[PDB]
Amino acid sequence: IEKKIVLRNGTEAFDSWEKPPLPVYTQFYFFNVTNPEEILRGETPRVEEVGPYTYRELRNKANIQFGDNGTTISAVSNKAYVFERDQSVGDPKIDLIRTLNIPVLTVIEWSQVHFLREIIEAMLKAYQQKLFVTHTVDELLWGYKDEILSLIHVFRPDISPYFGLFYEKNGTNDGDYVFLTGEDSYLNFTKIVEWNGKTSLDWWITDKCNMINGTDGDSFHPLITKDEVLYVFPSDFCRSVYITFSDYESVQGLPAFRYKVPAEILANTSDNAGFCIPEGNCLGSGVLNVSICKNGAPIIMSFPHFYQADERFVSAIEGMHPNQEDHETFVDINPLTGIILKAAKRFQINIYVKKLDDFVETGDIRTMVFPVMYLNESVHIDKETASRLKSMI
């Protein structure tokens, strides 16, 4: 039986789970801001799309421990990025990007006491701080010492002087996980049952929204059916997500079902009401306020170029040209085994920006969801692992 697919010491399923043989890549694309001064005078932003900066991933399950009479398994999943110049537009240690000053907007947000806010402006004034700043791709991705934060750190040692979109993420894991192994039922293969000791999330408004559904998205139960909907808990996206069957496809020499992230996921629906922290008040279709889980930083999640989002989000920023073939999230799963043969996980990091009377640095900036960068975390099965699998398929 395809019951061969269980996380039990000695199975091939286990080994490929513990030491993933498939090479995963992350490609970074940034939006270079061309008119900072004009943006501050209330004009429409104009951005230029820079990328890729291709990094090959290094993945490994650590701290593995079995449980509940072989029903469960606990582990962490370490991810490290190795830069590939040959596959990139340029050197991230040289190439520059003018974008928003996330540390300053992050600090302005954190302040809701007048004294606190008076202190911050004083520092911005004195230090001649700006809303639009230029850094290397490397500094933006991996971290740079910020002047304002360095000074805050002196008074509040809990506050880090460093900032990066992926700061302290090279080598680390996304917390402790306890997975249900396919021993009790195959449908229950790699199903997440706990994340950081909690069986559910606590940062959303409704019981439904806070649910931890599905697998980490790196695998799925065997014997899938064209009609079922598949759930994924992408830790980074801060909520569970489901994917729906699109069509049949052939990867290497193996059959697959093309599963895509449907529009409904981030649409302004009743089932997505609880993803709106201001007492139900929603920003709009195609965007997620990930502020609660991003330690108060004004981060807004979306899909690249605001694909599957409200037209107003696209009109807002000049240089946004969404399309399905370039911005969608798909995954080609071999139906029999549940093994991902080809995939593309694509999402965008945005900042919620607006004119603040207390902060001259904002000027007359339009109230908007500002694009910073998006990525393409992708996978493609190799001829060696594919041939190995054809024996089973």
Ligand X SMILES: *[C@@H]1O[C@H](CO)[C@@H](O[C@@H]2O[C@H](CO)[C@@H](O[C@@H]3O[C@H](CO)[C@@H](O)[C@H](O[C@H]4O[C@H](CO)[C@@H](O)[C@H](O)[C@@H]4O[C@@H]4O[C@H](CO)[C@@H](O)[C@H](O)[C@H]4NC(C)=O)[C@@H]3O)[C@H](O)[C@H]2NC(C)=O)[C@H](O)[C@H]1NC(C)=O
Ligand Y SMILES: *[C@@H]1O[C@H](CO)[C@@H](O[C@@H]2O[C@H](CO)[C@@H](O[C@@H]3O[C@H](CO)[C@@H](O)[C@H](O)[C@@H]3O)[C@H](O)[C@H]2NC(C)=O)[C@H](O)[C@H]1NC(C)=O
Ligand Z SMILES: *[C@@H]1O[C@H](CO)[C@@H](O[C@@H]2O[C@H](CO)[C@@H](O[C@@H]3O[C@H](CO)[C@@H](O)[C@H](O[C@H]4O[C@H](CO)[C@@H](O)[C@H](O)[C@@H]4O)[C@@H]3O)[C@H](O)[C@H]2NC(C)=O)[C@H](O)[C@H]1NC(C)=O
Ligand U SMILES: *[C@@H]1O[C@H](CO)[C@@H](O[C@@H]2O[C@H](CO)[C@@H](O)[C@H](O)[C@H]2NC(C)=O)[C@H](O)[C@H]1NC(C)=O
Q: 378 contacts which partner out of ligand X, ligand U, ligand NAG, none, CB within 5 to 8 A by kind? A: ligand X
Q: What is d(CA 294, CA 208) in angstroms, rounded to the nearest whole number?
A: 21
Q: What is d(CA 5, CA 171) in angstroms, rounded to the nearest whole number?
A: 28
Q: What is d(CA 12, CA 337) in angstroms, rounded to the nearest whole number?
A: 12
Q: Report helix angle 102-110 to 114-126, nearest 10.
A: 160
Binding of residue 50 to ligand Z (CB under 6 A): yes
The contact mask relative to ligand Y for 204-243 (x = CB under 6 A, - = no) is: ----xx-x-x-----------------x-------xx-x-
Provide, rounded to whole angstroms, the least separation between the CB of residue 377 and ligand X: 9
Binding of residue 88 to ligand Z (CB under 6 A): no
Dihedral angle computed from the Cα positions of residues 308, 314, 318 and 321, in that order, rounded to the nearest 10 degrees: 30
The contact mask relative to ligand Z for 134-173 (x = CB under 6 A, - = no) is: x---------------------------------------
Q: What is d(CA 334, CA 274) in angstroms, rounded to the nearest whole number?
A: 34
Copy the structure tokens of residue 83. 């830069």
Provide, rounded to whole angstroms, the least separation between the CB of residue 54 and ligand X: 7
Amino acid in position 391: S
Q: 239 contacts which partner out of ligand Y, ligand U, ligand NAG, none, CB within 5 to 8 A by kind? A: ligand Y
CB atoms within 10 A of CB 333: 27
Q: Contact at 8 Å (CB) between 209 and 233?
A: no
CB atoms within 10 A of CB 199: 12
Q: 97 contacts which partner out of ligand X, ligand NAG, ligand Z, none, CB within 5 to 8 A by kind? A: ligand Z
Copy the structure tokens of residue 266. 């981030």
Cα torsion 16, 170, 299, 85: sign? negative
At 346 the three-state DSSP class reads strand
Considering beta carbons, is residue 28 or 303 the nearer one to ligand U? 28
Binding of residue 325 to ligand X (CB under 6 A): yes
Q: 211 contacts which partner out of ligand U, ligand Y, ligand X, none, CB within 5 to 8 A by kind? A: ligand Y
Considering beta carbons, is residue 61 or 327 the nearer one to ligand X? 327
Considering beta carbons, is residue 27 or 337 the nearer one to ligand X? 27
Binding of residue 378 to ligand X (CB under 6 A): yes
Task: Please report, as residue ranges, which positions from 15 to 74 form the binding site for ligand X (by CB under 6 A).
Answer: 27, 29, 51-52
Q: Which stretch binds ligand Z (CB under 6 A): 93-101, 122-130, 212-220, 307-315?
A: 93-101
Binding of residue 277 to ligand Y (CB under 6 A): yes
| Terminal-to-terminal C-alpha distance of the chain | 12
Where on the chain is the footprint of ligand U (CB under 6 A)? 80-83, 142, 170-171
Considering beta carbons, is residue 22 or 133 the nearer one to ligand Z? 133
Q: What is d(CA 336, CA 256) in angstroms, rounded to the nearest whole number?
A: 9
Considering beta carbons, is residue 32 or 302 the nearer one to ligand Z? 32
Q: Contact at 8 Å (CB) between 267 and 287?
A: no
Which residues bind to ligand X, rule: CB under 6 A? 27, 29, 51-52, 304, 325-327, 344, 346, 376, 378
Which residues bind to ligand Z, rule: CB under 6 A? 32, 50, 95-98, 134
